[PDB]
Subunit: 316 residues, 4 copies
């Protein structure tokens, strides 16, 4: 180091600039558990970030994960993958995905996580994935001071995806052509909007008025029951759920990063709509570079809205 | 009573074979990494998962199915019975014993050779025309075992080999040179293990030989100590296993890279495990990585790399290290 | 020994039938738009181009081949002889006289019918198991034609139909509502032409009936004049021809969208041309667009859309228009 | 009117973060536009030209296929207020085409830099080597943000022909054509290889007159490629469209891949003038960040000085 050494790089490369240039489409993932890495690989293989930053308190695992993704750089189009306990690595993130945690036991963690994120990434959109996403989305919105539009919770984007996959299995149609929405709490009190289910615009409830009721001879209510028990079943089998939620988060990050303005059922403040006064639950929202820029005023039945009011009641 | 599906859909074809079916055997961290990477690259219209651990098998299958909306692979199945792998174009075998911290891949021979005695005959039974892509370790030896048990022609028995070692080597090249690995060209050949051989004479950027600009490239007298780049490649697996307990994402992307060239018949060059009896004066039925052309028929061609005395010797040494084990077994 | 032999050791002289081959018939602006879209979506391992123009055919092939470094389709063949189309899984037929400015797609019938009498039999000879994706106009009538000449079951003969008409309709929806066309759901059925039918009763966003919130949706007494959105869809092809002389990119993406569903057996729903005999009282062998489940066997199912008496009447009229032209053919 | 929208959408609330502009909507410009759209490189694409009809027709045709894309905003117009905040601007407008095209550049380059000051310039109009110098002088940008397509396609053609001869995908065939994007391009035979195996080492007569296999034809085909395609279909568009979109990917994503694009090579291979031509450069978000110093033989370096002297003459 004391002596001047002629480098192979100097013989080969002639330099013009010397600026990191600040990242343009950077994304950060807080938490490198199964869910965290699932979101990381899905984002990496969708070419959504020119720089990926991983952060978690377990530094031995954090480094191994980073090195594992870095070794596959040849097969990716994301030219920079960094990690580190210090949240300085997350500077200039356009989107921060939070999957860290094990409600109070996790709300404390948000106190130590959210400010660090907001410190180095003030203009970034928050995508809360940690459970209960309905409440922790309201938390990160209070601990951060960000405008509600830039505080998104994953919410029921996966519940609806599960709901449409089950629709397809019953109809022999790809879920892309099975339209249906699961709203409310991302949990046992989710609300299936039976009045919107359709294929090619044909309302199923109109064909089958018993749809979703107990008199339904086909028991389409079991479909929502499966959407609720899904995570319970996969967890009891493999110990956790990761692939499904990872693909869901990446599809949200796609709408946000690329500013597509697609409609997703993500958590957000619903003060006023449906008579609810108080805090955060999922509804169809347009998603773009500014996060939730709009809401869709879905016309719910009295029974549907009743459950939603019951879902918001359960939440706090 | 008419059902909702009949009120909605008028059927024409009451039928149901798949054209680009891929099977992943073993749903460990490696198998499931290959699965997700293949699913997200749209290489198959049907993905089959096979493993003995049924509880984890179904859970992984279900977890993948729930993301169907976000994928372009309309069918995902699983089961302990190999009949679910019928008519696969490509069978990726990842099941077996993986190395623990500090453990060498060659210490897995006895265990995985015994497992391959039960896997290969069943895969071959239901997919006699598929291409076998072996990932289980030690891959170089298990590729030879899979080729002996299967009875397939050597072109349809490929081992992932050094496709990842070379990817790691090119990544470390990119970090030193500040270039994307895609434009950093370097080959790690031989065993997918401690005896891998770096071909310094073939390293280049934009066709500029690096050993010509730096004649000490890869030697002990190298002031830049480029020999350490290959040391990291060899230690890579151990370093990551020591940090997170296993490897998954890098191998999964590498296997997906080979599957892409096989399924799409690209005829790209890859360093994959194949028999090299006759090349470089090697007279034993040994398998190891040389650059091969990969297509819908598997390994259709080998590229004969030009090696120096040191490089050719290190490759003959890597073969002797492997044959010393293949000849002690019973398969 | 040659340089190749000094460098490459061979193991397999045996070659295999192409596994995911697609053929595009016609190297016009429409055919080449389908070809470039299919290449950049990695739907095939072999692309074959066929046409009667020997010069333009070779030039288009070379122009694609020279960009092979940036594609994942390792074989691009072409030629006036249809033997280059052998073993195709999907044959996309775009050849034929195209719609000139002001002209109606229905004036091209007799010209392209004679052309299809030459194209279809040669295609069927070398790819008897393929799906036929008809794009030539009028696509609805020409789908019926290709089905009669080919002898295939009607599930393997598909017309691009109103897959583009519905895509154009959903783009205008998003423009008005400020939403991505993906999240704006609306269907245009019937003829791929002037007699198309907008299904207002199905229009929705996030499963919210728009006609329910706005009962006057699409009617003459409509405050927001939504019937114009459909009028734009009908006239879109005309306004595009007047500005650049033809339509290419949009149809190319729509056709590539259908090929994806077919080649990958996705079983998505698409509004494509097929026999609707048995729907809405129709008893004739008339072809037009309704939502169909597309897979590796082509059209496996049809969706029975619940239409209003006004929408259904429009569809009947559209069918009568095409049936009046179909029965007068040899 | 728009009363239904407020019945359905409850509002809560920007400039583009990944905008790209393609000046000129001819066969090349549209081939570049379509290639960029189907690679999801831009969140906004802007088409600009002078013929108001064709400009709108192309915009509409692309807009109709928006459902099949992920580019949520496609705009066009004659005024360059559409190209504002562009991170990359591809210049294809134009028609021995020096006098005609240099005139057009004097009119376009000023307007582009106005609304897009921090953008990178990707010059595709021919002669690309000279017009990259022209665009650089008129723009005032630092030479790292003025890129010419150059021999990126020439190398993409040189590769392929290699593939056909060897039975290998061009991805695994490596060869570099440098110099002027034209008849004076220089093929670096010393760098041709498959999997690091120098073809020149296995076959010393490679590319020379004594070549028994006549590999010099491969480069001849590359030089004649554009002529032969124009002679058959009347123009080239697809290959150059895919080539430009490849450069766009490295720039828009800051990949730092090596491409043989046209840039100033003052101080290399014996050149003190301000001449632009093709060498392997590393492309990223800031354009050409570095150059690769390819070791050229005595004959290779000779051709480059002549290909540079003539080019500089016009310049
Ligand atoms: C280590 N490992 C990882 C993954 N798999 C392994 C194994 O060792 C392994 C080794 C052998 C198997 N055999 C089968 O699956 C048998 C199966 C089939 O062949 O279909 C079958 C199904 C139904 C019947 C019937 F009709 F009689 F009921 C008979 C046979 C499975 C796993
Ligand atoms: Cl490699
Ligand atoms: Cl549609
Ligand atoms: Cl390579
Ligand atoms: Cl050109």
């Amino acid at each position: 180091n004391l002596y001047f050494q002629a480098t192979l790089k100097d013989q080969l490369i002639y330099n013009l600039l010397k600026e990191e240039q600040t990242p343009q489409n950077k994304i950060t993932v807080v938490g490198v558990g199964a869910v965290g890495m699932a979101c990381a690989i899905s984002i990496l293989m969708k070419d959504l970030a020119d720089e990926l930053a991983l952060v978690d308190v377990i530094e031995d695992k954090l480094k191994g994960e980073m090195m594992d993704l870095q070794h596959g750089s040849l097969f990716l189009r994301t030219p920079k993958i960094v990690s580190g306990k210090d949240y300085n690595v997350t500077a200039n993130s356009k989107l921060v995905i939070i999957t860290a945690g094990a409600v109070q036991r996790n709300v404390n963690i948000f106190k130590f996580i959210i400010p660090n994120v907001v410190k180095y990434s003030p203009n970034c959109k928050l995508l809360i994935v940690s459970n209960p996403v309905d409440i922790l989305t309201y938390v990160a919105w209070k601990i951060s001071g960000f405008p509600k539009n830039r505080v998104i919770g994953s919410g029921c984007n996966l519940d609806s995806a599960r709901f449409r996959y089950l629709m397809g299995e019953r109809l022999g149609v790809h879920p892309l052509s099975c339209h249906g929405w699961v709203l409310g709490e991302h949990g046992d009190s989710s609300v299936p909007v039976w009045s919107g289910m359709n294929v090619a615009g044909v309302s199923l409830k109109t064909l089958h008025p018993d749809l979703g009721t107990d008199k339904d001879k086909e028991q389409w209510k079991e479909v929502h029951k499966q959407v609720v028990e899904s995570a319970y079943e996969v967890i009891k089998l493999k110990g956790y759920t990761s692939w499904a939620i990872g693909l869901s988060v990446a599809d949200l990050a796609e709408s946000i990063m690329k500013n597509l303005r697609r409609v997703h059922p993500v958590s957000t403040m619903i003060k006023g709509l449906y008579g609810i006064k108080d805090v955060f639950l999922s509804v169809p929202c347009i998603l773009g570079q500014n996060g939730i820029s709009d809401l869709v005023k879905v016309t719910l039945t009295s029974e549907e809205e009743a459950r939603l009011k019951k879902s918001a009641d359960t939440l706090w």
